[PDB]
């Protein structure tokens, strides 16, 4: 009963050389590709990478795998995949990717009766996403996923999208493991890259991300604003509290510098300064300005000490010069 399909597979793999691409001496093997993004994984800012789980499909025509039988499509397992020629697709910006094999190699092979193949695989690609954190945390990146054909030159193997390029990378609705960004849309391109060996066709897929500033407002922005405001309320105190105004100033300085130190975790040690660092520096300057004002008042103290004019001018100008800066900093970036 099952002998008819067994001799079909035996007639297929007889005289078959898997070391040779289809049409090695006659044409170019065109590989049709599409990617189903099952789950866009978390983006590691410190390592400048991102994770993605996808159903990589490759389709190509093999004329040596023609058969005439009672079944049009041979839905086969992963053992047949290693006995035939498959393209050597690798990821150009990948770092460490895993082809899942629990409980059996997670792959697919459907030979139609003309020679068209379909080779799907489940993969979790950790790819390089180079980041430009000059507008951190109100930044938007385009993390690429480049893939091509290790060893197969443009004259041998070319790659193409099997659907329209706007519709050839599909992201599932429930598949979003991003807890910091949000995936704003996909973008593909196809190019020709040159190396020491030859010209290769490279397929680039861009994933346009955008950071959500909800963690950092509560993490640093709002504590730094409250640290400034708690230094702002020291001007309403008694002029002669030589030590009370002192503690306000030194504890605002301590909280400001520990917020400045702690607001550098999980993003890499870049040489430049982020927008959050500029907010840190301006709030730091407004904290130290309170101690400069208190040192001036304590230098100018001596039947009863009177209210300092430096204190009355700092009760109005110091909250207003903070309100000017926040309307400038939160427009400059949040605008676009």
């Amino acid at each position, epitope marked *: 009963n099952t002998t008819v399909f067994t001799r079909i597979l035996d007639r297929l793999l007889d005289g078959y050389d898997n070391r040779l691409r289809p049409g090695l001496g006659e044409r170019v093997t065109e590989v049709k590709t599409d990617i189903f993004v099952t789950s866009f994984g978390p983006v590691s800012d410190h390592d400048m990478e991102y994770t993605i789980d996808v159903f990589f499909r490759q389709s190509w025509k093999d004329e040596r795998l023609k058969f005439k039988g009672p079944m049009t499509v041979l839905r086969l397992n992963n053992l047949m995949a290693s006995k035939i020629w498959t393209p050597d697709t690798f990821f150009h910006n990948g770092k460490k990717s895993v082809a899942h094999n629990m409980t059996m190699p997670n792959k697919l092979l459907r030979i139609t009766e003309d020679g068209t193949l379909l080779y799907t695989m489940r993969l979790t690609v950790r790819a390089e996403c180079p980041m430009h954190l000059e507008d951190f945390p109100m930044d938007a990146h385009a993390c690429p996923l480049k893939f091509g054909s290790y060893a197969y030159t443009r004259a041998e193997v070319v790659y193409e999208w099997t659907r329209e390029p*706007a519709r050839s990378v599909v992201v599932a609705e429930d598949g979003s493991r991003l807890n910091q960004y949000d995936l704003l849309g996909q973008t593909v391109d196809s190019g020709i890259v040159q190396s020491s060996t030859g010209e290769y066709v490279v397929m680039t897929t861009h994933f346009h991300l955008k950071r959500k500033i909800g963690y950092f407002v509560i993490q640093t922005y709002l504590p730094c604003i409250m640290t400034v405001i708690l230094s702002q309320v020291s001007f309403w105190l008694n002029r002669e509290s030589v030590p009370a105004r002192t503690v306000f100033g030194v504890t605002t300085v301590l909280t400001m510098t520990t917020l400045s130190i702690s607001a550098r975790n999980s993003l890499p040690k870049v040489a430049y300064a982020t927008a959050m660092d500029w907010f840190i520096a301006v709030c730091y300057a407004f904290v130290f300005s309170a101690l400069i004002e208190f040192a001036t008042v304590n230098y100018f103290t001596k039947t009863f000490n009177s209210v300092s004019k430096i204190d009355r001018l700092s009760r109005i100008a110091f909250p207003l010069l903070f309100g000017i800066f926040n309307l400038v900093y939160w427009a400059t970036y949040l605008n676009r």
Partner: antibody
Amino acid sequence: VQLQQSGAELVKPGASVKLSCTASGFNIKDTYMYWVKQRPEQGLEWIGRIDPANGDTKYDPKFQGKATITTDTFSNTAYLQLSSLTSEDTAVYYCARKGLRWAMDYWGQGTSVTVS
Amino acid sequence: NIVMTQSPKSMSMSVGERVTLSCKASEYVGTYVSWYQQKPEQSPKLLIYGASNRYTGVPDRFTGSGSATDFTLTIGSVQAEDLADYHCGQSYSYPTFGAGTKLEL
């Protein structure tokens, strides 16, 4: 490598016309087939899409309903069905093979339709 | 859709000099445009695929150039047999084209 089309047509407005092109040198199940409209002294207007291996069709929203595309495997031939012909439908039609990097490689000679 | 807005409508120059066209895209099309010639009483033939890729049989004088949105086609030392009509397409989405550019003496 050659795309041969039918002859020119001349029917009354409000009728329907059958228009065809037969592909040679390859099989239509591999590459997509594209239909396009060339009005005289105007630009190209894409009609629709067909994938013959899958049977899927996608159409221009201004051409939806009034034009549909069919295929058959044995004849290696793509067809048009035009309905409710008017004065603005007087143009010349080409069927296009999808080529390398989706570029419309091969074009049929062109089939002229005329209403009266 | 994607709207191709190639400019100008017609150019009238002599034989043996440099002339360039310009194709503008309303949305992002990434190196997926195409360039065709349209002789009178003749079907279109492909010239450029991708963004700047010369098709087989095209002379070396026909050089394109591409980007994410702005596209151009440069002609070097145009001859008399190149006097035809040029069209810009795209295929990053469902395909559209542009009105076209003509050439005159």
